[PDB]
Amino acid sequence: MREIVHLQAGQCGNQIGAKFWEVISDEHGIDPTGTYHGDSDLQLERINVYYNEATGGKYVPRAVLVDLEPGTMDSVRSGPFGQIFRPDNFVFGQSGAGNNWAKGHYTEGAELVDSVLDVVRKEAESCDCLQGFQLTHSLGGGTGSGMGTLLISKIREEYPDRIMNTFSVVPSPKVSDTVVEPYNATLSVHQLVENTDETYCIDNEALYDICFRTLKLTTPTYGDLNHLVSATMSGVTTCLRFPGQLNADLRKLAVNMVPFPRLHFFMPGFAPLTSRGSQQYRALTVPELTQQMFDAKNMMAACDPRHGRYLTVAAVFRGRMSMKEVDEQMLNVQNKNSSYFVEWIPNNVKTAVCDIPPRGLKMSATFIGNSTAIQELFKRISEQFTAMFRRKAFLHWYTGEGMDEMEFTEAESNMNDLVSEYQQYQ
Amino acid sequence: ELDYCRLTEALVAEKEKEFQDYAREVIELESETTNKYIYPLVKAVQEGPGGGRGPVFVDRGGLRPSYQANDVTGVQLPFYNSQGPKYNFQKSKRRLGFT
Amino acid sequence: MRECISIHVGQAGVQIGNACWELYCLEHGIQPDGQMPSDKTIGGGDDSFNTFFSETGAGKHVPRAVFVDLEPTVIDEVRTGTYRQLFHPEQLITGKEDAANNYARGHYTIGKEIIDLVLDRIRKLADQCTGLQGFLVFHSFGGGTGSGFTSLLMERLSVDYGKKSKLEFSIYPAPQVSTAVVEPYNSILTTHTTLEHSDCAFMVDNEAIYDICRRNLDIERPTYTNLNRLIGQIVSSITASLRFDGALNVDLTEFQTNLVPYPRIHFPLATYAPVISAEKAYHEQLSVAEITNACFEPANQMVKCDPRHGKYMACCLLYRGDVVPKDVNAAIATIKTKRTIQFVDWCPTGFKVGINYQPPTVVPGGDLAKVQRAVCMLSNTTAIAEAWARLDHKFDLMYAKRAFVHWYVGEGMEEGEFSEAREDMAALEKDYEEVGVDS
Amino acid sequence: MRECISIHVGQAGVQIGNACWELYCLEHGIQPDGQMPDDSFNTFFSETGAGKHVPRAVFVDLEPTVIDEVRTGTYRQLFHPEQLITGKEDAANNYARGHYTIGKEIIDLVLDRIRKLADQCTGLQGFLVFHSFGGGTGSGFTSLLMERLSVDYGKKSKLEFSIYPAPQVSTAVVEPYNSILTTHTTLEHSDCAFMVDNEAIYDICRRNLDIERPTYTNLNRLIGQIVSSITASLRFDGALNVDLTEFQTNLVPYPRIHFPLATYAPVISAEKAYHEQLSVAEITNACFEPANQMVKCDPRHGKYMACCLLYRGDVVPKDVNAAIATIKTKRTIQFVDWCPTGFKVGINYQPPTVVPGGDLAKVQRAVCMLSNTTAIAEAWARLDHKFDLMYAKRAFVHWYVGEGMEEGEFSEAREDMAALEKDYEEVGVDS
Ligand SMILES: Nc1nc2c(ncn2[C@@H]2O[C@H](COP(=O)(O)OP(=O)(O)OP(=O)(O)O)[C@@H](O)[C@H]2O)c(=O)[nH]1
Ligand SMILES: Nc1nc2c(ncn2[C@@H]2O[C@H](COP(=O)(O)OP(=O)(O)OP(=O)(O)O)[C@@H](O)[C@H]2O)c(=O)[nH]1
Ligand SMILES: Nc1nc2c(ncn2[C@@H]2O[C@H](COP(=O)(O)OP(=O)(O)O)[C@@H](O)[C@H]2O)c(=O)[nH]1
Ligand SMILES: [Mg+2]
Ligand SMILES: [Mg+2]
């Protein structure tokens, strides 16, 4: 049966992967001990995708954890749900990277890649019919962005005819945290655009805007932000684990969103995100879901689609519904905003439905949209890269570890032609 | 199959309880005069089953799994207490609006 | 597992290492006898002390620092004072004759006698620890053994251990007050050594801490017994990310990559905020914005130089306590808008932050107050070239008339080291000016 | 079923023996009367039907002033009176007097009494002989004792503790004269032989033990603890044991080389033992330090070709092999190219015991190292120069000639020893 192998790279990836395995455990009804305590019977008929069977009726997540320092493996062991994860699946190291793409990719991640490949190959060959892989990592860190692209390139060579997803954490302009994060990110997207099917851009200041304005919270800790991130990660694989009127997988969403292999960057969004007091006033109805889904306040990437235009749009719905609402509403928003849609292809929307809603919720929707406004993010980080590299900034940390300056030059050109062909379709 | 798993867990718990009996009796016999040297004995009985420093999983029976994946050294993970307040998941869900 | 070894050279080093290690003991609850509190035998116990304290099966925690000084008078107060049972007897190295404010005597003649005894204990403290990030060094520029002995310690440690980290906490001479006369000779002749044999280096000025104590903490007549508490507070906040858990951690390797853009430019500056007395702490609220504004304030800066005259190069933020990262990102944004603070044109993202849950602790008899949050800033800029230009002018007018040189040339060293340190300093000042010039 | 006979010559051997047998009685729980207040003592204590135990040691001397305190002190009743052989007129620091004139009067008595002790033992494990290179009794009488013992007993192991003369300080002027004509005898009449420099123990006791004013009793306590670790596997069971035949085979590559260096660790006071944790990886580092050998030569000048390890106490074989590995990775220590695996390991369970009023403290794990090293050619080349400058204009030769030995034996020992110095030079050349 089709199964998903989960990858957790970096401290950011570990802290969002812990909350991801937190959420779908309650979706399938799994206690902190490891057993099953549920109410219905459909929660057990598709559980092999994320969970492997054990003795005594125990289920363990199908995930491996990758990081280079022991600082954050403790927090993913002493957390509330840290005792469900397998103790053998933790792959850590003596020496970290420390916000350095060069050390993470060539001299520190080259030794730990042998161990984690042995772990993931041992698990994946035990799968009956593996569907695909899923990676969570950040572009602003040494370990997630350094050897995370080394993990991508290695298993692409080893498993060609597969699918992989990534939930990449691109850096933010105003919530910038690393000084050398253009070096950590531009060198990563050069190795990311070649061998990735699906890419979700999750930006931190987008989550700060949603928690402050729409949800009206005062103290948005990272435990709150990862719940928003995990709402979409659980919201993309709903029809694979729960039956519905019109099922859709990652591959079915893949073939409808990418028209060309170099156009695979997307804009995740979650429709029900009303604040706690405003909940009693807002009716939960299909036009209310599709109105908030297309709002620019709900975008999880730091760009506005008004400045560009939508290329392809995916919609995944949750809950028992009548879809004569979801076809007339998506036709209405396609007809009204004619200037924001391309005209060289009609009927740009793929629609999917799922019967089972998330716990505590009646209705839900997930948005995956491809556009040209992603180039605004790419131009914003390329101009900081150009304004930094031309005076040989921070280069002794990079050119002294094996790699030459021609790798910087080709990362300039490959990113420049990528945004050039993004403009050609605009 | 479920019955066998419960039986094996019960046998392991009985063995650990017998060790606890012996250890408590030896410490009580040794601490008759002074308690100035019972620290290694207290540390040994408070080591926890298995080479682990994380909190015991009381619902699992006090298991302390070990984490040694570091090239050829294999040093265990350290332990640190957190000053951050604990959270309830139902409270977090209701705050974030999934209710 | 993330052990850290301290090297304290000079009378300044052994006096700062007293208040700093007192703060370390009270932070982890170490009694002056050496053991953990016996009442805290309740099950648990975090392994946050192994980075500073060794382990014995008896329960005794021995510090992993070495105290070196050529003056036996100030070392022997440790053997007489309160902490005589905590420190290991073999970890405090005593000479016989002091260097007497001189570079040549502390380098070539007397420093060679004890260069083997210290490094034997260094090897014994290095094979004890499994993973060592690097060594912290406390020394003073003006001292004889602070300049002469350290200038051979760095060169031989670089060969003994290749790529280990080398943090440097240096007591820089004040531009106005002075406790010695030949301290320009001691300062200049060792900067050639620290140019090539130091990974990172901070600087502190004694009169710059003097104005902070008299103006902020409402203490009229301070002493070195509370200045060392302020320095020990700085070192504690830097290393507390290693010791204690945080929302996002920073290592000693992490920030040295973000503050050193060039191998010849490894001089940032330290700043602590808030430093508020007890009677004033209960009046004002201490928010994240109101503690990150004082770090950018040049009056609160503890080096006698002005970043308003210079331009900021890179910044590091060490947040400790009840702090939310939303207010950190908001406070960073509102600083970036103000044109009084000037950044270089090729470093648009010049910030790096760190978050720690545990608030800092205080000591009995201390002058700082119990606060819920605090911040330490490690900012690099071009404004140190002001302090270099105001010191080498005094060095040049000292050397014009061949003064105090016979106190150096007769001890073994030649005279061409004066001119080569003069030429190296001129190249360094030209290097800082060329980097500060934008395109 | 295993039995060892102790032989002590000279005043140094007697004083070492009293300190050794104090440790032995307290280790086995023996009152000074000789009776206990389960059969580990059979190698050293003979059994009497009344319950008493008699040691298997022969104390010999040629001056009554040393044996008199043994017959007077606390252990006056413990020792058998026929075991304490006393001469009439000592050789007085003369090798020729102790070999050709005085030693033949009592060589019948000591060789008769060693037969009575060897009669009681069913299987002999080895003869321990304590002797000094300096004094006449430890040099002259010891020399022809082995020459008689080599033909009296064929293949029985005779382990040796030499007192090598000090390089810089001295008790005697003619001590280089004595310490050379015995090297000829000990080449073909000694199985294994350990050596010691006095001021090295003086440096260890001054620096490590915090004793600014030691005596020969304080040295003899440290020597006795070196002795006890060898016989600990004979008297106590371990995870894996080592016998006298075992380590003597693995440390001599040639019959001309049987001179290794012993080194004990940890040596520490009761004050510093409260501070320092003593793990097995931390006590094995002290056996390689140039400041902590018992021998006044630095092995960094030479190179190792054979090493033996004696671990005693709460020790784990995993951390032993881990500590052996990390020493091999260190490039400061060097091994010969013709011996890649030069290590031998012994394990004992019982921790070493200490005597009241002693120097050391109770320890949970300790290590003794027996390492053969090329660097003993360093000390011999220093001492060879001292000998022949003294012999350049024939100093003190009238004393040795007039005793009865011919004048050619001095040059006979010199052309012998020059060959052995050349022998060690060509062992250390790389292939
Ligand atoms: N900030 C600070 N500086 C100190 C302290 N103690 C000594 N110093 C500095 O040390 C300098 C004088 O040198 P010392 O450290 O006292 O003596 P030394 O290093 O042994 O060198 P010699 O005087 O030659 O023996 C003064 O200029 C002070 O700036 C201290 O507690 N705090
Ligand atoms: N290592 C060590 N050597 C000792 C000790 N006591 C004596 N010696 C050595 O013994 C040598 C002198 O011989 P003595 O022990 O005095 O007596 P002897 O060996 O019987 O020689 P004679 O007095 O001539 O009969 C000196 O050179 C010392 O090196 C000791 O306690 N330890
Ligand atoms: N959305 C989100 N971002 C995070 C989280 N934790 C860390 N980050 C971001 O990740 C960056 C630090 O990543 P880092 O730890 O250096 O990655 P690593 O080097 O691979 O471990 C910071 O700039 C944070 O903004 C999280 O829980 N959620
Ligand atoms: Mg001094
Ligand atoms: Mg004598």
Side-chain angles (χ1 to χ4, degrees), chain A residues 30-50:
Chain A
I30 295 302
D31 59 353
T33 313
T35 57
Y36 163 71
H37 285 144
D39 294 333
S40 72
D41 73 81
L42 61 83
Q43 300 174 359
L44 288 198
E45 61 86 20
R46 288 299 162 86
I47 209 163
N48 44 17
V49 190
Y50 278 135

Side-chain angles (χ1 to χ4, degrees), chain A residues 364-378:
Chain A
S364 167
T366 313
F367 174 109
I368 298 162
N370 196 1
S371 173
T372 300
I374 297 89
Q375 177 162 191
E376 167 181 352
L377 188 153
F378 284 168

Side-chain angles (χ1 to χ4, degrees), chain C residues 235-342:
Chain C
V235 191
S236 86
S237 178
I238 290 180
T239 316
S241 77
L242 278 75
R243 312 203 286 268
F244 297 106
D245 202 339
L248 61 84
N249 304 7
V250 65
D251 289 357
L252 295 174
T253 312
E254 196 156 345
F255 73 79
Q256 72 178 358
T257 58
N258 294 324
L259 271 67
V260 170
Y262 289 97
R264 318 273 320 267
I265 316 173
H266 52 90
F267 289 155
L269 308 97
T271 308
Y272 199 88
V275 287
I276 299 305
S277 76
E279 61 264 14
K280 289 179 206 171
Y282 293 160
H283 280 88
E284 65 183 1
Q285 56 173 358
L286 276 300
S287 70
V288 182
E290 298 191 20
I291 64 171
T292 193
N293 283 321
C295 284
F296 283 100
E297 171 50 76
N300 208 279
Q301 187 93 27
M302 64 184 73
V303 183
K304 290 308 284 210
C305 67
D306 208 343
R308 308 193 157 214
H309 303 337
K311 44 179 71 68
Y312 285 87
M313 272 315 327
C315 302
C316 189
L317 277 298
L318 271 296
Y319 283 107
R320 217 191 171 186
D322 174 50
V323 58
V324 53
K326 150 200 159 183
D327 271 298
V328 168
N329 303 318
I332 283 172
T334 196
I335 293 299
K336 272 182 190 272
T337 61
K338 284 180 171 174
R339 308 269 68 77
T340 314
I341 294 92
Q342 178 181 340

Side-chain angles (χ1 to χ4, degrees), chain D residues 10-12 61 90 92-93 132 135-138 163 171 175 198 216 219-220:
Chain D
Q11 167 181 196
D61 208 330
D90 43 352
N93 269 5
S132 302
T137 57
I163 302 299
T171 300
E175 75 174 3
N198 274 28
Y216 291 168
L219 277 73
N220 288 0

Side-chain angles (χ1 to χ4, degrees), chain B residues 39-40 42-43 46 53 64 70 75-85, chain C residues 1-2 41-43 45-48 55 57-59 242-243 245 357-359:
Chain B
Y39 163 93
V42 168
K43 185 203 177 181
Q46 281 196 325
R53 335 194 69 89
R64 265 176 157 179
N70 184 6
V75 185
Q76 307 280 332
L77 298 183
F79 178 49
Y80 314 102
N81 280 117
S82 83
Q83 294 272 319
Chain C
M1 181 185 167
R2 281 171 269 133
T41 313
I42 303 100
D46 55 354
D47 280 294
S48 71
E55 182 66 26
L242 278 75
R243 312 203 286 268
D245 202 339
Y357 283 80
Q358 182 170 301

Side-chain angles (χ1 to χ4, degrees), chain D residues 43-95:
Chain D
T43 182
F44 287 159
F45 292 93
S46 179
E47 267 277 358
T48 318
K52 271 200 60 160
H53 310 299
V54 164
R56 300 198 171 83
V58 185
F59 287 64
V60 298
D61 208 330
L62 286 179
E63 182 177 1
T65 65
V66 187
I67 314 293
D68 170 45
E69 201 86 9
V70 177
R71 310 150 166 271
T72 299
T74 307
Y75 303 133
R76 58 180 183 89
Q77 203 144 340
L78 196 146
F79 291 165
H80 193 68
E82 316 265 358
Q83 300 274 53
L84 319 177
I85 306 294
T86 301
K88 210 160 276 303
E89 175 179 354
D90 43 352
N93 269 5
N94 290 138
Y95 173 82

